[PDB]
Scaffold this active site. Structure first.
Site, PDB file in Angstrom:
ATOM      1  CD1 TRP A   1      -1.465   2.539   1.801  1.00  0.00           C
ATOM      2  CD2 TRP A   1      -2.567   1.685   0.069  1.00  0.00           C
ATOM      3  NE1 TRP A   1      -2.410   3.454   1.335  1.00  0.00           N
ATOM      4  CE2 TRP A   1      -2.990   2.966   0.247  1.00  0.00           C
ATOM      5  CE3 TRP A   1      -3.698   0.817  -0.855  1.00  0.00           C
ATOM      6  CZ2 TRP A   1      -4.053   3.615  -0.378  1.00  0.00           C
ATOM      7  CZ3 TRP A   1      -4.296   1.670  -1.633  1.00  0.00           C
ATOM      8  CH2 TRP A   1      -4.778   2.838  -1.316  1.00  0.00           C
TER       9      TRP A   1
ATOM     10  CG  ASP B   1       8.656   8.440  -8.243  1.00  0.00           C
ATOM     11  OD1 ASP B   1       9.149   7.947  -7.047  1.00  0.00           O
ATOM     12  OD2 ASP B   1       8.756   9.566  -8.674  1.00  0.00           O
TER      13      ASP B   1
ATOM     14  CD  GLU C   1       9.014   4.044  -0.236  1.00  0.00           C
ATOM     15  OE1 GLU C   1       9.809   3.222  -0.530  1.00  0.00           O
ATOM     16  OE2 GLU C   1       8.487   4.449   0.694  1.00  0.00           O
TER      17      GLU C   1
ATOM     18  CD  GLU D   1      20.464   7.759  -0.911  1.00  0.00           C
ATOM     19  OE1 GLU D   1      20.179   8.691  -0.103  1.00  0.00           O
ATOM     20  OE2 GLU D   1      19.655   6.847  -0.631  1.00  0.00           O
TER      21      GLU D   1
END
Ligand SMILES: [N+]
Length: 371
Positions: free
Chosen positions: A117, A167, A170, A327
């Site tokens: 969800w 996407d 998120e 990242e």
């Protein structure tokens, strides 16, 4: 090009990239996203893992890449019943809720790591089909080793490719994201053009659905000659060059490929560091190693070696003391005010991010710089 100072640093970053990935690979085969980042630790993503597996396969570690495809394959065979149940629901006109769909986060033992969800995404299934087919092609492997898991992913994607979902980042569950559509397209064209899969019952359907994806991107995903982040949007996203290389909505020489590379560079690339999207407030909206690597890969494929090299050098300059790639870096922030509350909640930026190292290995390989 490169003096022996630069060549030695780039070779060493490649070897370390191989090492950090294989050292953190789970015993079961999964590649984790980031072993030390609070919000990601303990989970595996097919998106991160597939690009990681492609870097490792290009590097030549057939054993490591193979255990990752074994892991994914087995995780998908275990969802044969769940996918069959979803398809049968669709056939009765009882379209299942996002809450019933296949997951985004996996545990290393192949269980849902999260409730779809909150993070329903279809791109990772398409990236895995692309990854396993490209790996098998490169090393002359029999895809029958992973066929039953491929069958689950194909069946799922042929049913759900046109569904809105979050996407890669998120966000925006209501929208159909062009890099998500692109990932599914790459997977379906990979299996649909694979001679070893010519007798699969879905063979023709994969190329017909890939054509349906290109029709939808044509109609709603191209503005002023460039791809857009989601159907019906004017803006770009840093993930969009993946829709050229490797997912192939258009190839490198196409005008839309060129316009999309130029729009991403203008709107989102600062001094070689590529941002995700204009509104990005995650750690202030920093510069993402994997997106600089993706733009660089796409410039290489299009014959712009210089531009590719400039992005590789930018990436190599973000390596820390140990050669770990984070990242993202904050040298330019889209929304600097937001960084502090992220460092406070989740800690220092994920380092190493395995996907950063995977993308490093791919771009290095595209420039012929692997040892
Ligand atoms: N390439």
């Amino acid at each position: 090009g490169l003096d022996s100072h630069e060549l030695a640093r780039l070779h060493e970053l490649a070897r370390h990239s191989h090492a950090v990935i294989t050292r953190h690979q789970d015993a079961g085969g999964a590649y984790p996203a980031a072993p030390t980042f609070s919000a990601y630790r303990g989970y595996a993503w097919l998106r991160d893992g597939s690009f990681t597996a492609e870097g490792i396969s290009r590097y030549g570690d057939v054993a490591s890449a193979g255990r990752f495809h074994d892991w994914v394959d087995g995780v998908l065979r275990r969802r044969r019943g769940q996918v069959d149940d979803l398809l049968a629901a669709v056939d009765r006109g009882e379209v299942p809720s996002n809450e019933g769909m296949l997951p985004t986060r996996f545990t290393f033992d192949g269980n849902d790591g999260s409730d779809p969800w909150w993070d329903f995404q279809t791109d990772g299934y398409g990236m895995w089909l692309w990854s396993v087919v490209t790996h098998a092609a490169r090393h002359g492997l029999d895809l029958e080793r992973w066929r039953a898991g491929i069958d689950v992913a194909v069946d799922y994607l042929l049913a759900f490719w046109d569904r809105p979902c979050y996407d890669w980042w998120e966000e925006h569950v209501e929208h159909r994201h062009v890099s998500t559509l692109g990932a599914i397209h790459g997977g379906l064209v990979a299996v649909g053009t694979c001679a070893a899969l010519r007798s699969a019952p879905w063979s023709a359907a994969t190329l017909q659905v890939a054509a349906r994806i290109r029709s939808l991107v044509s109609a709603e995903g191209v503005v002023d000659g460039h791809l857009v982040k989601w159907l019906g949007s004017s803006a770009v996203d840093g993930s969009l060059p993946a829709c050229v290389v490797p997912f192939g909505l258009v190839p490198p020489d196409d005008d839309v490929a060129a316009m999309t590379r130029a729009a991403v560079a203008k709107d989102l690339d600062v001094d070689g560091g590529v941002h995700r999207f204009a509104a990005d407030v995650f750690y202030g909206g920093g510069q993402w190693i994997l997106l600089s690597a993706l733009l660089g890969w796409n410039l290489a494929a299009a014959g712009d070696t210089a531009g590719a090299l400039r992005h590789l050098r930018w990436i190599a300059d973000q390596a820390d003391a140990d050669g770990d790639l984070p990242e993202q870096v904050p040298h330019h922030l889209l929304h600097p005010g937001s960084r502090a509350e992220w460092v406070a909640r989740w800690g220092t930026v994920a380092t190493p991010l395995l996907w950063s190292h995977g993308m490093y290995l791919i771009l290095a390989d595209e420039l012929g710089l692997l040892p």
